[PDB]
Design a protein around this ligand. Structure first.
Ligand SMILES: O=C(O)CCCC(=O)C(=O)O
Ligand SMILES: [Mg+2]
Length: 263
């Protein structure tokens, strides 16, 4: 289920990571490696993770992508994927994001969880996840594919760490029993007006199903979700482009709001 040589995995990881670190797009890597598999692509992603760890970055969480109809439709792919979150991705509520470090960024409204017990696949179900949730965190992702025109096939996107680049936490961060993640309403405002909205159920029917799916995907590589992991469960709505001068506010039903501005 692999077609890359080890040398190619290491070199592709450097190439793709450099596009992020040096703020430029690249061609879809499947153009040069058309036989590349998902296992190849995740090898590349985890090697990028290793590069970041080796230079001292902490990995502060994981994200699930392409979990909602809206995001599947927008990106043309219907296969859920995951990627990792590095510490310097983090942005404080109300913070300023420097777009000069970004290529062609978009924002997504999500709900995140922090776990308090390990989760393992395979065969992880919704009922296995519930007690492992410590609390929930309103989170806006900034995604920024390193591929030109934000156009990819899923294998390329996995290799590019599922387009991850920034995330903004905010609002009220409460216990799971206090928050219905299925019916949680989310309203995205940009420059003072509503531009997107949705409910948590858009994420695979229930955001906690995304957590179960992540455990199952990780198990394919012998990995799991350690206790204390921050997980972004997926874009509830279509992603919206942002640019210098923009301000955004995402309102979470009963949980306040997350805001940011861009320069
Ligand atoms: O859309 C992309 O470029 C991939 C990132 C997907 C994602 O983070 C989400 O659906 O929440
Ligand atoms: Mg996302």
């Amino acid at each position: 289920n692999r077609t890359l040589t080890r040398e190619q995995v290491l070199a592709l990881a450097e190439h793709i990571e450099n596009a992020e670190l040096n703020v430029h797009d690249i061609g879809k890597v499947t153009n040069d490696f058309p036989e590349m598999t998902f296992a190849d692509a995740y090898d590349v992603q985890w090697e990028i993770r290793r590069r970041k760890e080796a230079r001292g970055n902490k990995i502060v969480g994981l994200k699930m992508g392409l979990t909602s109809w809206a995001k599947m439709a927008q990106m043309g792919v219907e296969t859920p994927i995951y990627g990792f979150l590095a510490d310097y991705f983090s942005v404080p509520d109300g913070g300023v994001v420097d777009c000069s470090k970004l290529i062609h960024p978009k924002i997504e409204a999500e709900i995140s969880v922090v776990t308090k017990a390990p989760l393992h696949g395979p065969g992880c179900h919704l009922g296995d996840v519930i007690a492992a949730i410590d609390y929930v965190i309103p989170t806006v992702e900034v995604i920024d594919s390193r591929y030109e025109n934000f156009k990819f096939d899923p294998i390329s996107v996995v290799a590019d760490n599922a387009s991850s680049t920034r995330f903004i936490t905010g609002g009220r961060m409460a216990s799971l029993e206090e928050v219905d993640l299925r019916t949680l309403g989310v309203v995205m405002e940009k420059n003072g007006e509503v531009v997107e909205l949705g409910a948590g159920a858009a994420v695979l029917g229930h955001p906690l199903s995304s957590v179960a799916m992540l455990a199952n995907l990780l198990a394919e590589r012998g990995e799991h979700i350690p206790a204390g992991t921050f997980i972004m469960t997926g874009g509830i709505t279509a992603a919206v482009p942002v640019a210098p001068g923009d301000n955004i506010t995402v309102r979470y039903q009963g949980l306040g709001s997350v805001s940011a501005r861009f320069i």
